[PDB]
Amino acid sequence: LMLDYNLNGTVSRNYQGGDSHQFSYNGTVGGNLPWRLRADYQGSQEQSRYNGEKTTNRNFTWSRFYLFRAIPRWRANLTLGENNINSDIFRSWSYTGASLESMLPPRLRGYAPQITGIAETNARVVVSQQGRVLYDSMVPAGPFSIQDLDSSVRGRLDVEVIEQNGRKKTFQVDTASVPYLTRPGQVRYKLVSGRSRGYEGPVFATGEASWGLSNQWSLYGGAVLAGDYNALAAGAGWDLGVPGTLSADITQSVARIEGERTFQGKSWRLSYSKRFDDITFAGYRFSERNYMTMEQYLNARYRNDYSSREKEMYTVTLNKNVADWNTSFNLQYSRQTYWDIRKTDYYTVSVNRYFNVFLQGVAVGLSASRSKYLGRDNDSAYLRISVPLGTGTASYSGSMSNDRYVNMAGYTDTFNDGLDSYSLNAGLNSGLTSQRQINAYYSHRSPLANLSANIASLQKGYTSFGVSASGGATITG
């Protein structure tokens, strides 16, 4: 019986008084009985004490836990228990039930949705989808690129960057929606049944299939039979060569909510993907005022929420490594508009060049990003020149988050071959009298157990300490 723990803990004081605690954990229990196991758990506890009020927000749940078993001979996998639907045609909601679903040319499957951004401090970053916790551990200040996500992540993700000074900056990233294509002989499909979760739960079945026409083309369809909510979708997909693959989808919905009225709508979606084995992906989507996803409907029927009616959604992704002049470029953009509320443009860019000027690998990196700090836009840029000095490396950093700019000097030293490392930094925040910053971050990365602690302190500001451990153990008595 396997366990995959992930822990976080942080303590901090204010220069005005307050203490606060933060402990979070998430992980997965696995078991083997052709009957396989998978239980995802996640929880957190937060406390704060000011002049008069302590506050506490505490949460725990099994996001999802189910049994799944492989079958030799339909190349299909059966899974039953509490899960989440993962579709290449429909969007996601959580459910209890079972499902039967069909390794083949990568150019047709989905890949790991690498999330990127920028942190003012040494910050804990949590990536989620719906309520499910996909990633939440600490990051050292500066641009960050989380490439630890489950091979099967789909849809758009919710990222929260909780900074050491108490500022929560949040944004959204859209994972690439790779064309649901197939090779002529084969057939891809996904037929799921059960009742929708967490709002007993309305009964629903959903099917989705991908036919292999005799050309470099392929047609797919799917339907959602939820009763008060039904949706049908058909789509055409086309394969190319190295110039990537492509596809388009039209999907209509019928939703009937009590004494409220009845909504009808469709949404068209065009997506292109040139990744295989430089990755580039561009996707588009435009949906009607009355078109709703299974999720949208549910929040509408059970929670009385009709907010966030999607209109148009553009999303571009380019991670191109020109080994040629020794520079990598990554772009993650996602513009999203609505019928009821204001547009929401989220992006993050970075370009890293490796130089030779005096000895090897002097590094200059420029990064820029925009997220949201409490409704209002938060716009950042980061400039870092790093000089490698033996097993260590000294660096200078210039940060510009909104109207507050930070200057940083620091030395980082690595050991155990890159597994462990330890860095000390000192700097100045100005943008409002200036403050001196002192900060140290330590990391240990063994494959069976990771661990990392960091301590930070701002003048007339805050002072906090945080640890973050994650590893693998077998819990069987």
For the CB of residue 227, give the shortest distance to ligand LDA in the complex, in Å: 10
Q: Contact 458/433 with Cβ under 8 angstroms?
A: no
Sign, Cα dihedral of 368, 371, 372, 373:
negative
Q: How far apart are CA 345 and CA 172, in angstroms?
A: 9
Place of tokens 């001979």: 73
Give the binding range for ligand LDA (CB under 6 A) out of 9-17, 189-197, 262-270, 469-477. Answer: 189-197
230 is an interface residue for ligand LDA by CB under 6 A? no
For the CB of residue 209, give the shortest distance to ligand LDA in the complex, in Å: 13
Q: Which of 20, 17, 32, 149 shows the shortest CA–CA distance to 476?
A: 32
193 is an interface residue for ligand LDA by CB under 6 A? yes
Sequence-distant (6+) residues with CB within 8 A of 115 are 127, 135, 145, 146, 149, 157, 159, 173, 332
* Cβ proximity to ligand LDA, 170 vs 193, nearer residue: 193
**Coil, strand or helix at 154:** coil
Q: Give the residue, chosen from 1, 104, 203, 322, that forms a contact with ligand LDA under the rule CB under 6 A.
A: 203
Give the binding range for ligand LDA (CB under 6 A) out of 190-198, 273-281, 335-343, 461-469. Answer: 190-198
Give the binding range for ligand LDA (CB under 6 A) out of 81-89, 200-208, 377-385, 462-470. Answer: 200-208
For the CB of residue 194, give the shortest distance to ligand LDA in the complex, in Å: 6
| Residue 223 vs residues 100, 101, 247: alpha-carbon distances, Å | 15, 15, 18
For the CB of residue 204, give the shortest distance to ligand LDA in the complex, in Å: 6
Q: How far apart are CA 67 and CA 72, in angstroms?
A: 17
For the CB of residue 195, give the shortest distance to ligand LDA in the complex, in Å: 7
Q: Which of 222, 219, 123 shows the shortest CA–CA distance to 163?
A: 123
Neighbours of 337 (CB within 10 A): 15
Q: How far apart are CA 448 and CA 146, in angstroms?
A: 19
* Cβ proximity to ligand LDA, 60 vs 74, nearer residue: 74
* Cβ proximity to ligand LDA, 205 vs 363, nearer residue: 205
* Cβ proximity to ligand LDA, 82 vs 174, nearer residue: 82
455 is an interface residue for ligand LDA by CB under 6 A? no
Q: Which of 389, 89, 131, 397 shows the shortest CA–CA distance to 236?
A: 89
- Phi first, then psi: what are they for 394, rounded to 5°? -95, 145
What number of chain residues touch ligand LDA (CB under 6 A)?
Answer: 9
Q: Give the residue, chosen from 2, 3, 78, 232, that forms a contact with ligand LDA under the rule CB under 6 A.
A: 78
Q: Which of 381, 352, 353 shows the shortest CA–CA distance to 367?
A: 381
Burial of 375 (0-12, 13-18, 19+ CB in 10 A): exposed
Q: What DSSP string runs through 282-350?
A: EEEEEE-TT---HHHHHHHHHS------EEEEEEEEEEEEETTTTEEEEEEEEEEEESSS--EEEEEEE
351 is an interface residue for ligand LDA by CB under 6 A? no
* Cβ proximity to ligand LDA, 191 vs 383, nearer residue: 191
* Cβ proximity to ligand LDA, 97 vs 410, nearer residue: 97
Residue nearest to ligand LDA (CB): 193
71 is an interface residue for ligand LDA by CB under 6 A? no
191 is an interface residue for ligand LDA by CB under 6 A? yes
- Phi first, then psi: what are they for 166, rounded to 5°? 100, 5
For the CB of residue 78, give the shortest distance to ligand LDA in the complex, in Å: 5
For the CB of residue 207, give the shortest distance to ligand LDA in the complex, in Å: 8
366 is an interface residue for ligand LDA by CB under 6 A? no
* Cβ proximity to ligand LDA, 118 vs 223, nearer residue: 223
Place of tokens 């229990």: 29
For the CB of residue 153, give the shortest distance to ligand LDA in the complex, in Å: 23
For the CB of residue 205, give the shortest distance to ligand LDA in the complex, in Å: 4
Q: What is the per-residue binding string for ligand LDA in 94-133, x denoting contact by CB under 6 A?
A: ----x-x---------------------------------
Half-sphere exposure of 347 (CA within 13 A, CB side): 18
Q: How far apart are CA 336 and CA 372, in angstroms?
A: 14
For the CB of residue 34, give the shortest distance to ligand LDA in the complex, in Å: 13
What is the helix (H) or strand (E) element at residue 63, kind and residue range?
strand 54-70
426 is an interface residue for ligand LDA by CB under 6 A? no
Give the binding range for ligand LDA (CB under 6 A) out of 181-189, 202-210, 348-356, 368-376. Answer: 202-210
Give contact residues for ligand LDA (rule: CB under 6 A).
78, 98, 100, 191, 193-194, 203-205
